[PDB]
Amino acid sequence: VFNATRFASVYAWNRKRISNCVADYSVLYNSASFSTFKCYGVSPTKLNDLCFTNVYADSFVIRGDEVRQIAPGQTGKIADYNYKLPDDFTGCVIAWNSNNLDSKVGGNYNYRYRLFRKSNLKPFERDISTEIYQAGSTPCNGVQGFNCYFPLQSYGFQPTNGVGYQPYRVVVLSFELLHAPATVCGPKKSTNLVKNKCVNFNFNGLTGTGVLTESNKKFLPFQQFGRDIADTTDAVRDPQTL
């Protein structure tokens, strides 16, 4: 996702899915990689401490000045047309300078984007409609002209472009938190279970302190974490040895 040679276009972006694996987020700060790393919904440094169930990464390339328009609540020809994040979006956004690679001579036509649309697109939706954008009352008849423009345009990429006009490889990091068991977590080794003693327990992402004993409750085959009338933690299911 991050180190891939070529990403997809932001007009239609490839979403790579990562689940059931070991995610090492410490290697990022151990070996410097991301040039621009910022997290809107979470902290930049807390990805390693807390781990998530499913990971969703959208790899795409956009112009420099177009990076700030991808974020919850932001507006622009990107957020409002091709790629839109939801207002409640919780995740991270990464960017770095590929200009010495992606840029070819006068331009690169492999990365394209929607420069025009007749409305505001919904978040997490890929619109393949090529319909000519009509700004005025003149009928376009499916061709360019006065107040008639083709919505999908290609990014100008050149080695001589300025910091704002140079390409930056962008990858949006989305995740699912506490909606399922955690299949993506770092090298955290499981230890032996302690009973009849007060201990600090971390079970399938549930952290807390309490005495661990054998419960008389009978969970159904699909049930996992029990809770009392107070909606607190009553009994839990050990994900390793059931």
């Binding site: 009392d228 009338i229 107070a230 607190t232």
Partner: peptide, 29 residues
């Protein structure tokens, strides 16, 4: 009149103090 949420309350820091005079001492009076 009936004098479990109680167990859950004590987990959040809720405590119930015992009475000084028991129910038997009340019967003595």
């Amino acid at each position: 009149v009936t004098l479990d949420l109680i167990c859950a309350q004590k987990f959040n820091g809720l405590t119930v103090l015992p009475p000084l005079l028991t129910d038997e001492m009340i019967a003595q009076y």
